[PDB]
Paper text:
Many of currently used antibiotics inhibit protein synthesis in pathogenic microorganisms by targeting their 70S ribosomes, which are complex macromolecular machines responsible for this process. The catalytic peptidyl transferase center (PTC) located at the heart of the large ribosomal subunit (50S in bacteria) polymerizes amino acids into polypeptides in the order specified by the nucleotide sequences of the translated mRNAs. Newly-made proteins emerge from the ribosome through the nascent peptide exit tunnel (NPET) that spans the body of the large ribosomal subunit beginning at the PTC and ending on the opposite side of the large ribosomal subunit facing the cytoplasm. Here, we discover that well-known ribosomal antibiotics, hygromycin A (HygA) and macrolides, which target peptidyl transferase center and peptide exit tunnel, respectively, can act cooperatively against susceptible and drug-resistant bacteria.
The obtained electron density maps revealed all three drug pairs bound to their previously known binding sites on the 70S ribosome. Consistent with the previous structure, HygA binds in the A-site cleft of the PTC on the large ribosomal subunit with its aromatic ring sandwiched between nucleotides A2451 and C2452 of the 23S rRNA, and is oriented such that the aminocyclitol group protrudes toward nucleotide C2573, while the fucofuranose ring extends into the ribosome exit tunnel. Most importantly, the presence of a neighboring macrolide (either ERY, AZI, or TEL) does not affect the binding position of HygA, in which it interferes with the full accommodation of the amino acid moiety of an incoming aminoacyl-tRNA (aa-tRNA) into the ribosomal A site, resulting in inhibition of peptide bond formation. In all three structures of macrolides in combination with HygA, the desosamine moiety of a macrolide forms two hydrogen bonds (H-bonds), which were suggested to be crucial for macrolide binding: one between the hydroxyl group of the desosamine and the N1 atom of the nucleotide A2058, and the second one between the dimethylamino group of desosamine sugar and the N6 atom of A2058 via a water molecule that is also coordinated by the phosphate of G2505. Although ribosome-bound HygA and either of the macrolides (ERY, AZI, or TEL) do not form H-bonds with each other, their fucofuranose and desosamine groups, respectively, come into physical proximity and form van der Waals contacts.
Residue numbers in the entry:
A (entry chain 17): 1 to 48
B (entry chain 1D): 2 to 276
Amino acid sequence: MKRTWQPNRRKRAKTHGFRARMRTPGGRKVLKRRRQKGRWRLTPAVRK
Amino acid sequence: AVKKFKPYTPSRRFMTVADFSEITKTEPEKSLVKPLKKTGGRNNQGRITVRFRGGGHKRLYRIIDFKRWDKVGIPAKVAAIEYDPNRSARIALLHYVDGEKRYIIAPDGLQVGQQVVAGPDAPIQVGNALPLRFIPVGTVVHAVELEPKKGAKLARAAGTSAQIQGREGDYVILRLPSGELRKVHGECYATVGAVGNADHKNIVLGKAGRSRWLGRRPHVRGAAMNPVDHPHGGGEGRAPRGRPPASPWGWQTKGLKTRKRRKPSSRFIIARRKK
RNA sequence: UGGUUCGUGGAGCCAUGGGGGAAUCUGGGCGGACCACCGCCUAAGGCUAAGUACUCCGGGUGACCGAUAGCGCACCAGUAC
RNA sequence: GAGCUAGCCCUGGCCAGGGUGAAGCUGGGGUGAGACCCAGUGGAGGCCCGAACCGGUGGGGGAUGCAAACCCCUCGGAUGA
RNA sequence: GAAUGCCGGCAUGAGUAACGAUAAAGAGGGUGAGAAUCCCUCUCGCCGUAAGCCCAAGGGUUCCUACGCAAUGGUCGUCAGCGUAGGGUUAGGCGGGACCUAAGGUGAAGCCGAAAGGCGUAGCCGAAGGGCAGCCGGUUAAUAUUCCGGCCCUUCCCGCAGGUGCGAUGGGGGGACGCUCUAGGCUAGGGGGACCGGAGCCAUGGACGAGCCCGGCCAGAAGCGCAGGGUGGGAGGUAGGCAAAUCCGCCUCCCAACAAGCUCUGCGUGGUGGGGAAGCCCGGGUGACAACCCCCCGAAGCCAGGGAGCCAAGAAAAGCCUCUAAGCACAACCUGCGGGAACCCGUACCGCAAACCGACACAGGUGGGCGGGUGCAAGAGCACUCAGGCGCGCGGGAGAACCCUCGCCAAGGAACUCUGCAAGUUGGCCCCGUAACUUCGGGAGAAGGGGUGCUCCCUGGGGUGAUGAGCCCCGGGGAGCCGCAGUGAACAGGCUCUGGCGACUGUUUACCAAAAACACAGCUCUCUGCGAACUCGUAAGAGGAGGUAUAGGGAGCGACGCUUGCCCGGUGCCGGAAGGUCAAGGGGAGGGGUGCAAGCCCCGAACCGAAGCCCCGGUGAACGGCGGCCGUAACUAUAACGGUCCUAAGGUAGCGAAAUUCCUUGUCGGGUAAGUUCCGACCUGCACGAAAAGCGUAACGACCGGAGCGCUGUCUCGGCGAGGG
RNA sequence: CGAUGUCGGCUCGUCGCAUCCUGGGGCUGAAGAAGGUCCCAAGGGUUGGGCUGUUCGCCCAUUAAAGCGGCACGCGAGCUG
RNA sequence: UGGGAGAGGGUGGUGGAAUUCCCGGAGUAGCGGUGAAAUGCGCAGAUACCGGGAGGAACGCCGAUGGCGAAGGCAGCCACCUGGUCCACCCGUGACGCUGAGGCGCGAAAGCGUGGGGAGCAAACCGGAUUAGAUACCCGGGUAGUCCACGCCCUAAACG
RNA sequence: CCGAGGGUAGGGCCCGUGACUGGGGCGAAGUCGUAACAAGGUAGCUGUACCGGAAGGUGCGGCUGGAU
Ligand SMILES: [Mg+2]
Ligand SMILES: [Mg+2]
Ligand SMILES: [Mg+2]
Ligand SMILES: [Mg+2]
Ligand SMILES: [Mg+2]
Ligand SMILES: [Mg+2]
Ligand SMILES: [Mg+2]
Ligand SMILES: [Mg+2]
Ligand SMILES: [Mg+2]
Ligand SMILES: [Mg+2]
Ligand SMILES: [Mg+2]
Ligand SMILES: [Mg+2]
Ligand SMILES: [Mg+2]
Ligand SMILES: [Mg+2]
Ligand SMILES: [Mg+2]
Ligand SMILES: [Mg+2]
Ligand SMILES: [Mg+2]
Ligand SMILES: [Mg+2]
Ligand SMILES: [Mg+2]
Ligand SMILES: [Mg+2]
Ligand SMILES: [Mg+2]
Ligand SMILES: [Mg+2]
Ligand SMILES: [Mg+2]
Ligand SMILES: [Mg+2]
Ligand SMILES: [Mg+2]
Ligand SMILES: [Mg+2]
Ligand SMILES: [Mg+2]
Ligand SMILES: [Mg+2]
Ligand SMILES: [Mg+2]
Ligand SMILES: [Mg+2]
Ligand SMILES: [Mg+2]
Ligand SMILES: [Mg+2]
Ligand SMILES: [Mg+2]
Ligand SMILES: [Mg+2]
Ligand SMILES: [Mg+2]
Ligand SMILES: [Mg+2]
Ligand SMILES: [Mg+2]
Ligand SMILES: [Mg+2]
Ligand SMILES: [Mg+2]
Ligand SMILES: [Mg+2]
Ligand SMILES: [Mg+2]
Ligand SMILES: [Mg+2]
Ligand SMILES: [Mg+2]
Ligand SMILES: [Mg+2]
Ligand SMILES: [Mg+2]
Ligand SMILES: [Mg+2]
Ligand SMILES: [Mg+2]
Ligand SMILES: [Mg+2]
Ligand SMILES: [Mg+2]
Ligand SMILES: [Mg+2]
Ligand SMILES: [Mg+2]
Ligand SMILES: [Mg+2]
Ligand SMILES: [Mg+2]
Ligand SMILES: [Mg+2]
Ligand SMILES: [Mg+2]
Ligand SMILES: [Mg+2]
Ligand SMILES: [Mg+2]
Ligand SMILES: [Mg+2]
Ligand SMILES: [Mg+2]
Ligand SMILES: [Mg+2]
Ligand SMILES: [Mg+2]
Ligand SMILES: [Mg+2]
Ligand SMILES: [Mg+2]
Ligand SMILES: [Mg+2]
Ligand SMILES: [Mg+2]
Ligand SMILES: [Mg+2]
Ligand SMILES: [Mg+2]
Ligand SMILES: [Mg+2]
Ligand SMILES: [Mg+2]
Ligand SMILES: [Mg+2]
Ligand SMILES: [Mg+2]
Ligand SMILES: [Mg+2]
Ligand SMILES: [Mg+2]
Ligand SMILES: [Mg+2]
Ligand SMILES: [Mg+2]
Ligand SMILES: [Mg+2]
Ligand SMILES: [Mg+2]
Ligand SMILES: [Mg+2]
Ligand SMILES: [Mg+2]
Ligand SMILES: [Mg+2]
Ligand SMILES: [Mg+2]
Ligand SMILES: [Mg+2]
Ligand SMILES: [Mg+2]
Ligand SMILES: [Mg+2]
Ligand SMILES: [Mg+2]
Ligand SMILES: [Mg+2]
Ligand SMILES: [Mg+2]
Ligand SMILES: [Mg+2]
Ligand SMILES: [Mg+2]
Ligand SMILES: [Mg+2]
Ligand SMILES: [Mg+2]
Ligand SMILES: [Mg+2]
Ligand SMILES: [Mg+2]
Ligand SMILES: [Mg+2]
Ligand SMILES: [Mg+2]
Ligand SMILES: [Mg+2]
Ligand SMILES: [Mg+2]
Ligand SMILES: [Mg+2]
Ligand SMILES: [Mg+2]
Ligand SMILES: [Mg+2]
Ligand SMILES: [Mg+2]
Ligand SMILES: [Mg+2]
Ligand SMILES: [Mg+2]
Ligand SMILES: [Mg+2]
Ligand SMILES: [Mg+2]
Ligand SMILES: [Mg+2]
Ligand SMILES: [Mg+2]
Ligand SMILES: [Mg+2]
Ligand SMILES: [Mg+2]
Ligand SMILES: [Mg+2]
Ligand SMILES: [Mg+2]
Ligand SMILES: [Mg+2]
Ligand SMILES: [Mg+2]
Ligand SMILES: [Mg+2]
Ligand SMILES: [Mg+2]
Ligand SMILES: [Mg+2]
Ligand SMILES: [Mg+2]
Ligand SMILES: [Mg+2]
Ligand SMILES: [Mg+2]
Ligand SMILES: [Mg+2]
Ligand SMILES: [Mg+2]
Ligand SMILES: [Mg+2]
Ligand SMILES: [Mg+2]
Ligand SMILES: [Mg+2]
Ligand SMILES: [Mg+2]
Ligand SMILES: [Mg+2]
Ligand SMILES: [Mg+2]
Ligand SMILES: [Mg+2]
Ligand SMILES: [Mg+2]
Ligand SMILES: [Mg+2]
Ligand SMILES: [Mg+2]
Ligand SMILES: [Mg+2]
Ligand SMILES: [Mg+2]
Ligand SMILES: [Mg+2]
Ligand SMILES: [Mg+2]
Ligand SMILES: [Mg+2]
Ligand SMILES: [Mg+2]
Ligand SMILES: [Mg+2]
Ligand SMILES: [Mg+2]
Ligand SMILES: [Mg+2]
Ligand SMILES: [Mg+2]
Ligand SMILES: [Mg+2]
Ligand SMILES: [Mg+2]
Ligand SMILES: [Mg+2]
Ligand SMILES: [Mg+2]
Ligand SMILES: [Mg+2]
Ligand SMILES: [Mg+2]
Ligand SMILES: [Mg+2]
Ligand SMILES: [Mg+2]
Ligand SMILES: [Mg+2]
Ligand SMILES: [Mg+2]
Ligand SMILES: [Mg+2]
Ligand SMILES: [Mg+2]
Ligand SMILES: [Mg+2]
Ligand SMILES: [Mg+2]
Ligand SMILES: [Mg+2]
Ligand SMILES: [Mg+2]
Ligand SMILES: [Mg+2]
Ligand SMILES: [Mg+2]
Ligand SMILES: [Mg+2]
Ligand SMILES: [Mg+2]
Ligand SMILES: [Mg+2]
Ligand SMILES: [Mg+2]
Ligand SMILES: [Mg+2]
Ligand SMILES: [Mg+2]
Ligand SMILES: [Mg+2]
Ligand SMILES: [Mg+2]
Ligand SMILES: [Mg+2]
Ligand SMILES: [Mg+2]
Ligand SMILES: [Mg+2]
Ligand SMILES: [Mg+2]
Ligand SMILES: [Mg+2]
Ligand SMILES: [Mg+2]
Ligand SMILES: [Mg+2]
Ligand SMILES: [Mg+2]
Ligand SMILES: [Mg+2]
Ligand SMILES: [Mg+2]
Ligand SMILES: [Mg+2]
Ligand SMILES: [Mg+2]
Ligand SMILES: [Mg+2]
Ligand SMILES: [Mg+2]
Ligand SMILES: [Mg+2]
Ligand SMILES: [Mg+2]
Ligand SMILES: [Mg+2]
Ligand SMILES: [Mg+2]
Ligand SMILES: [Mg+2]
Ligand SMILES: [Mg+2]
Ligand SMILES: [Mg+2]
Ligand SMILES: [Mg+2]
Ligand SMILES: [Mg+2]
Ligand SMILES: [Mg+2]
Ligand SMILES: [Mg+2]
Ligand SMILES: [Mg+2]
Ligand SMILES: [Mg+2]
Ligand SMILES: [Mg+2]
Ligand SMILES: [Mg+2]
Ligand SMILES: [Mg+2]
Ligand SMILES: [Mg+2]
Ligand SMILES: [Mg+2]
Ligand SMILES: [Mg+2]
Ligand SMILES: [Mg+2]
Ligand SMILES: [Mg+2]
Ligand SMILES: [Mg+2]
Ligand SMILES: [Mg+2]
Ligand SMILES: [Mg+2]
Ligand SMILES: [Mg+2]
Ligand SMILES: [Mg+2]
Ligand SMILES: [Mg+2]
Ligand SMILES: [Mg+2]
Ligand SMILES: [Mg+2]
Ligand SMILES: [Mg+2]
Ligand SMILES: [Mg+2]
Ligand SMILES: [Mg+2]
Ligand SMILES: [Mg+2]
Ligand SMILES: [Mg+2]
Ligand SMILES: [Mg+2]
Ligand SMILES: [Mg+2]
Ligand SMILES: [Mg+2]
Ligand SMILES: [Mg+2]
Ligand SMILES: [Mg+2]
Ligand SMILES: [Mg+2]
Ligand SMILES: [Mg+2]
Ligand SMILES: [Mg+2]
Ligand SMILES: [Mg+2]
Ligand SMILES: [Mg+2]
Ligand SMILES: [Mg+2]
Ligand SMILES: [Mg+2]
Ligand SMILES: [Mg+2]
Ligand SMILES: [Mg+2]
Ligand SMILES: [Mg+2]
Ligand SMILES: [Mg+2]
Ligand SMILES: [Mg+2]
Ligand SMILES: [Mg+2]
Ligand SMILES: [Mg+2]
Ligand SMILES: [Mg+2]
Ligand SMILES: [Mg+2]
Ligand SMILES: [Mg+2]
Ligand SMILES: [Mg+2]
Ligand SMILES: [Mg+2]
Ligand SMILES: [Mg+2]
Ligand SMILES: [Mg+2]
Ligand SMILES: [Mg+2]
Ligand SMILES: [Mg+2]
Ligand SMILES: [Mg+2]
Ligand SMILES: [Mg+2]
Ligand SMILES: [Mg+2]
Ligand SMILES: [Mg+2]
Ligand SMILES: [Mg+2]
Ligand SMILES: [Mg+2]
Ligand SMILES: [Mg+2]
Ligand SMILES: [Mg+2]
Ligand SMILES: [Mg+2]
Ligand SMILES: [Mg+2]
Ligand SMILES: [Mg+2]
Ligand SMILES: [Mg+2]
Ligand SMILES: [Mg+2]
Ligand SMILES: [Mg+2]
Ligand SMILES: [Mg+2]
Ligand SMILES: [Mg+2]
Ligand SMILES: [Mg+2]
Ligand SMILES: [Mg+2]
Ligand SMILES: [Mg+2]
Ligand SMILES: [Mg+2]
Ligand SMILES: [Mg+2]
């Protein structure tokens, strides 16, 4: 049947993207935390 | 007159439709329509604030002239009478000798080809508009302003009207559609005659589908819900109300008056509505 | 109403959201209701090192660990997944 | 977190074929004029039968499955909320 | 040594289950260390509204070639979507951007919020919508509307020539719109040809034939032709389209008007460029100087912004045209022609799937287009089959029980069982014929029955032609032939009688309930006079509504028919300027601390002092409620009648052992040989009853009861057979 | 209670005997035939249907007879539900 | 052809008295009702009086034993539209007539449907009396309805 | 071919009968009240409508076949 992951690149970038996170207080705290942890990727990589 | 159908479906047995007999033109003036942004009953937060709205037929909004004292002394010809999906009354397209075209709401008995005009000097005939000072006591009227130059507010739906009952100083006394008696400022404009399409209220939708065409989604009784949802919710099997009948938000709904008491307009309302 | 040890208590002191509303030393605040006496102090402008805190970083040293321990990672780890 | 799901909003798309034959219209009849009746025309409808499409009625199978809801047979809607 | 402890390792179950659709395989030849599994050939089967082809998501080198087989592959492997390496994606015209706007998002001005932030007209961003210039063919191992070939086209810059009051982010036009149905003429696509081109074939009894088999086109500027779309012209006045206007709108006049004319698209033609089958021969040659023509069918596509009807009344903005404003009128713009200029990103491959979502090379899920032929009434249904693609990544045997899916069955025919659960029966089309009841639509495909193939002969109307033949479509009548059987295979209702509940089509517990539940038109109560009530938000701001009492909110009830009684003492709601109670505050009689004092400070009586409550009324489609006992009539029985306690008042009409009845399988009647169920009655209703509506009601229901006919392996009662295990 | 699945039906039995029938007996208010009552006896047998989920029971038509109990109210890693 | 009388019918308008309600004023201890009473209403200011407003229905006098119509039935006043009928002239037509089974139309009140309107009155209903009792007669309240439009119903002591 | 009739199926009319139910007639020796005939103690009768144990009542409109 139809499952939960229906990939959509524009949706991905617009929802979890770098400019999405930076627009908002909680989104920058995500970036601060992910940078503090040493994550190689601060944000999901969608091909574009 | 309203039009019936033969019972060739279970819904056509009861469906009735407006005959549309006064309508002389089936397309709207392109310069007077604009898109009507459908809300679905949702507000600027995205939240439902009026339940069970949405899904109706697409509509363009006809720009109506609810001021009329714009063009004192300038006569206009009644060029057409049109359907308006945004209101129960019909609309009439006016052709001012100015060259300017405007929509008013069509009074009862308005004739295409006749002339109307607005102003303190207008004759007391259907379609003309005057400040209330100059309309004779007893004449029935519509598209009444509430305050001067703020636009027609009262008696706007199909078949409705108000009656001038007398004068008192700077104000005239109107019997509003609801039966209320109200002072209204004499400089407020009005339009002589009743609103047209008085058969509007004899329409029988006939089927659930018809309501849906109009943007009315199904209504859910509180008694069919659960206690999380509604005061009337829950109960094992069916259940009487078991408390004073209440809205989804807990307030009582059988008689509880809700007009604010200290409202400044009370100094102008003589007698609360009848019936 | 808050702060203080003070939770309405005899409840002062310091702060102030509302109302009323002064004086310039013979002016004014405080000494735990309040009054007198006796003292202390100078509100409604601002600044000021040092002694104090912390440990991303550098070093020194362990009756600290020794690869299931010690940091999640001694190794290409905030990786693979 | 509404890329699942629920509702709404904007903008596009889809619905083989067959059946029934409403109003209206034209003609004829009728009448003082009408109502109305008959025929032809017509093509209405949360109309009918049935694929796509949307479903999930009863049974059987499956049950460390092909599958964390599937398969076969049957069955509901299919111009409409 | 134990914590169903934690991490790791290794056992048991066990050579067991399984190896992922029952579309299916066999042989020969090759390669190789090794072959059921790789390559090649022949034979067989399966899909063909797909299991074929194209496009968009998503995936991201999986594409091509060489060399490999440790692992990955449910076996094997020499093979591969795997390992290594090299190569491969070419655009002014295709898609997106240097254009437009939609919801929405953002957001100068502005507004609001302790902070963070929330809003917000314009503007901007935002597409699969508007707009915009490329078709056919060839070529690579792998790209092609991109390279090449032929023929076309767009914008920008500059110049030349003619022309004009030129000029805009401003004004106006236009862009610009629904659903259903549909005309004319075309194109796509298809069928036939005794005609045109073609390598060949004559088998096994016959045929050298009007034989078989194969193919008989594609693109194309201007011009022309056919078919459609769009659009009236002139003058005069003008106060409106936030300036101006010659434009547009309005009034008037005059010609024109279903015409023509001007313009635009489609189709045909068209210089020109291409393609080109079967067979044969080792993807390529040949066929071939290939031929390339006539007839019929015909779109849901095209002309298109076509036409009609209908109510639920159907985006925006830019491009485009027109008007004028500053300005500028050696400029500028318009038209023609010529040269130059023309950027960025995508393009491989998979794409109903082994490359996407499902941990898997997973019987599941995935939006748009093409989707041939014949026959069956039609069709995208069904059977077979074309092009194209496959035989589903374990096999070989055997022929037990049992299981699964399937076929048949003597006599009986529901006796099975909770229940005909399941499975039979019925089954399309044409004709005949069809009941109660009914809201006059229906019920209805009611029920029930007859016909159905092929052959010859006669014949009627239509379509295309031309009026004819030919082709295609719809029929009619007569006489015959064969079989058990003619929708001869496949796809295709079993029917009726009678209750309950719900009017109806719809909706629901994604994944145990589809229903009598929710919704529904419709009924009533109630609130709301507009800066509405009400909802969201601290607010600003929104929704309501660019609506205005024939409207909007809340509640119950639930088509329709006939109806909806009595109780306002309690609670609710509504009304009541009296009265009672009533907090802060006002007031300050009187009292207290302290001071030598004037004075400072504290307590405090009467009285004044809101809403609310109390109090007085009203109100039931507001919350709710709606009795008991004794007695009485020519036999008994019962009680129309009287008496009496209690209550706010004591259940009306209608219905009743009921979706409600405990006693209960109540009693009586019907149906059955026999009926705890069913239907009809009665009424001592444990414990119906009138909008948590009462009683009915045609039609409707994958709802739940009861009965009958038809027919059956459900059964007496079992047997045999098939295929996958 | 870190789980001992439940009524009824179907299937499959096996056992007890306080015996329903068949076999053997005593008594009889046993003439015969038919019965009554008690004793011995468990080898075998103990039907098909209507109602109801029912066990049970009632009823129909038969029968030599239409027995009663136990086995986790026998039997759901055997089925039904 | 020329005249007449008339509440004959339909549509649109419009006038005054009275009843009730609301507002203002003034005023106070009762009003109302009956055979007599009580319920009811009234110091929360009634009744009685004056001024203002709203609204519905019916039209006093004229009015008669009268007029009109086929019947039912028709009553303020104005206008429009329209029927029947009588009279005088004796002008035209030339028996064109009478009746009338079926048909069609009309048809008081009550009742029905959809919508409006609602002052007064008033079935049902509630209360007070009366009475042996009183589901009545009398009194205080009161919903349909009574009124308007359109569609039904089609009855009568529709009687002379 | 037709064809007595038989068979399957569906309709129409008539008769008998049926748990139970509606009223009607008669009986009369009962219970309740007294609706009509007199102004019958509320003049009566009436079509209709709503209501009540019963006769009946009330509303609306009509008749006199109504006493004074
Ligand atoms: Mg997942
Ligand atoms: Mg999706
Ligand atoms: Mg993905
Ligand atoms: Mg995307
Ligand atoms: Mg996208
Ligand atoms: Mg998206
Ligand atoms: Mg982003
Ligand atoms: Mg990571
Ligand atoms: Mg890195
Ligand atoms: Mg992130
Ligand atoms: Mg009309
Ligand atoms: Mg109708
Ligand atoms: Mg109709
Ligand atoms: Mg009709
Ligand atoms: Mg119906
Ligand atoms: Mg109509
Ligand atoms: Mg109209
Ligand atoms: Mg339109
Ligand atoms: Mg526009
Ligand atoms: Mg709008
Ligand atoms: Mg809006
Ligand atoms: Mg917004
Ligand atoms: Mg938001
Ligand atoms: Mg949000
Ligand atoms: Mg709401
Ligand atoms: Mg809504
Ligand atoms: Mg309208
Ligand atoms: Mg209308
Ligand atoms: Mg209605
Ligand atoms: Mg609508
Ligand atoms: Mg609604
Ligand atoms: Mg509802
Ligand atoms: Mg519920
Ligand atoms: Mg919740
Ligand atoms: Mg709660
Ligand atoms: Mg609650
Ligand atoms: Mg409740
Ligand atoms: Mg409930
Ligand atoms: Mg309850
Ligand atoms: Mg419930
Ligand atoms: Mg209950
Ligand atoms: Mg409930
Ligand atoms: Mg319910
Ligand atoms: Mg309850
Ligand atoms: Mg209730
Ligand atoms: Mg309650
Ligand atoms: Mg106001
Ligand atoms: Mg203390
Ligand atoms: Mg303190
Ligand atoms: Mg302060
Ligand atoms: Mg001092
Ligand atoms: Mg001092
Ligand atoms: Mg101080
Ligand atoms: Mg101090
Ligand atoms: Mg001290
Ligand atoms: Mg000090
Ligand atoms: Mg220092
Ligand atoms: Mg320091
Ligand atoms: Mg150590
Ligand atoms: Mg060490
Ligand atoms: Mg280690
Ligand atoms: Mg470690
Ligand atoms: Mg480290
Ligand atoms: Mg480690
Ligand atoms: Mg690593
Ligand atoms: Mg759209
Ligand atoms: Mg369809
Ligand atoms: Mg027809
Ligand atoms: Mg028509
Ligand atoms: Mg349908
Ligand atoms: Mg249909
Ligand atoms: Mg259908
Ligand atoms: Mg769906
Ligand atoms: Mg199913
Ligand atoms: Mg089945
Ligand atoms: Mg089966
Ligand atoms: Mg199963
Ligand atoms: Mg499972
Ligand atoms: Mg399946
Ligand atoms: Mg299936
Ligand atoms: Mg089916
Ligand atoms: Mg269907
Ligand atoms: Mg269809
Ligand atoms: Mg439908
Ligand atoms: Mg729709
Ligand atoms: Mg131990
Ligand atoms: Mg374990
Ligand atoms: Mg264990
Ligand atoms: Mg462990
Ligand atoms: Mg462990
Ligand atoms: Mg092992
Ligand atoms: Mg073995
Ligand atoms: Mg084993
Ligand atoms: Mg398998
Ligand atoms: Mg091999
Ligand atoms: Mg090998
Ligand atoms: Mg091969
Ligand atoms: Mg991937
Ligand atoms: Mg490639
Ligand atoms: Mg590769
Ligand atoms: Mg390998
Ligand atoms: Mg190997
Ligand atoms: Mg290997
Ligand atoms: Mg492997
Ligand atoms: Mg595998
Ligand atoms: Mg090799
Ligand atoms: Mg592979
Ligand atoms: Mg290479
Ligand atoms: Mg090119
Ligand atoms: Mg550029
Ligand atoms: Mg833009
Ligand atoms: Mg675009
Ligand atoms: Mg393009
Ligand atoms: Mg081209
Ligand atoms: Mg290539
Ligand atoms: Mg438009
Ligand atoms: Mg559009
Ligand atoms: Mg539609
Ligand atoms: Mg056509
Ligand atoms: Mg072509
Ligand atoms: Mg064809
Ligand atoms: Mg031969
Ligand atoms: Mg043509
Ligand atoms: Mg002008
Ligand atoms: Mg062409
Ligand atoms: Mg060739
Ligand atoms: Mg050649
Ligand atoms: Mg040659
Ligand atoms: Mg040749
Ligand atoms: Mg079509
Ligand atoms: Mg059109
Ligand atoms: Mg409408
Ligand atoms: Mg816009
Ligand atoms: Mg200038
Ligand atoms: Mg020009
Ligand atoms: Mg650039
Ligand atoms: Mg690029
Ligand atoms: Mg490419
Ligand atoms: Mg699929
Ligand atoms: Mg596979
Ligand atoms: Mg798959
Ligand atoms: Mg094709
Ligand atoms: Mg067929
Ligand atoms: Mg067919
Ligand atoms: Mg099919
Ligand atoms: Mg074929
Ligand atoms: Mg296979
Ligand atoms: Mg074997
Ligand atoms: Mg199979
Ligand atoms: Mg058999
Ligand atoms: Mg049978
Ligand atoms: Mg039989
Ligand atoms: Mg049954
Ligand atoms: Mg069958
Ligand atoms: Mg069949
Ligand atoms: Mg029948
Ligand atoms: Mg009928
Ligand atoms: Mg129907
Ligand atoms: Mg039937
Ligand atoms: Mg044959
Ligand atoms: Mg056969
Ligand atoms: Mg088949
Ligand atoms: Mg069928
Ligand atoms: Mg059956
Ligand atoms: Mg039936
Ligand atoms: Mg029912
Ligand atoms: Mg239903
Ligand atoms: Mg239901
Ligand atoms: Mg109903
Ligand atoms: Mg309903
Ligand atoms: Mg329904
Ligand atoms: Mg449907
Ligand atoms: Mg479920
Ligand atoms: Mg569930
Ligand atoms: Mg779940
Ligand atoms: Mg669930
Ligand atoms: Mg299920
Ligand atoms: Mg369910
Ligand atoms: Mg269903
Ligand atoms: Mg539900
Ligand atoms: Mg419901
Ligand atoms: Mg109703
Ligand atoms: Mg709130
Ligand atoms: Mg706002
Ligand atoms: Mg708004
Ligand atoms: Mg708005
Ligand atoms: Mg509104
Ligand atoms: Mg409902
Ligand atoms: Mg009926
Ligand atoms: Mg009663
Ligand atoms: Mg009460
Ligand atoms: Mg009360
Ligand atoms: Mg009371
Ligand atoms: Mg209560
Ligand atoms: Mg004092
Ligand atoms: Mg003292
Ligand atoms: Mg009521
Ligand atoms: Mg109570
Ligand atoms: Mg209630
Ligand atoms: Mg007695
Ligand atoms: Mg009762
Ligand atoms: Mg009973
Ligand atoms: Mg019974
Ligand atoms: Mg019942
Ligand atoms: Mg009960
Ligand atoms: Mg009980
Ligand atoms: Mg019972
Ligand atoms: Mg019982
Ligand atoms: Mg019984
Ligand atoms: Mg039963
Ligand atoms: Mg039952
Ligand atoms: Mg009884
Ligand atoms: Mg309820
Ligand atoms: Mg109920
Ligand atoms: Mg249903
Ligand atoms: Mg159903
Ligand atoms: Mg049968
Ligand atoms: Mg069997
Ligand atoms: Mg066999
Ligand atoms: Mg077998
Ligand atoms: Mg086999
Ligand atoms: Mg076998
Ligand atoms: Mg336990
Ligand atoms: Mg355990
Ligand atoms: Mg366990
Ligand atoms: Mg004897
Ligand atoms: Mg013995
Ligand atoms: Mg024995
Ligand atoms: Mg034994
Ligand atoms: Mg039994
Ligand atoms: Mg029993
Ligand atoms: Mg018994
Ligand atoms: Mg015997
Ligand atoms: Mg036992
Ligand atoms: Mg026991
Ligand atoms: Mg027991
Ligand atoms: Mg047991
Ligand atoms: Mg058991
Ligand atoms: Mg089990
Ligand atoms: Mg069991
Ligand atoms: Mg077990
Ligand atoms: Mg066990
Ligand atoms: Mg069972
Ligand atoms: Mg169960
Ligand atoms: Mg007083
Ligand atoms: Mg008189
Ligand atoms: Mg004469
Ligand atoms: Mg009448
Ligand atoms: Mg009447
Ligand atoms: Mg009234
Ligand atoms: Mg009534
Ligand atoms: Mg009524
Ligand atoms: Mg009436
Ligand atoms: Mg008379
Ligand atoms: Mg015979
Ligand atoms: Mg015979
Ligand atoms: Mg009397
Ligand atoms: Mg009497
Ligand atoms: Mg009398
Ligand atoms: Mg009664
Ligand atoms: Mg009584
Ligand atoms: Mg009475
Ligand atoms: Mg009369
Ligand atoms: Mg008399």
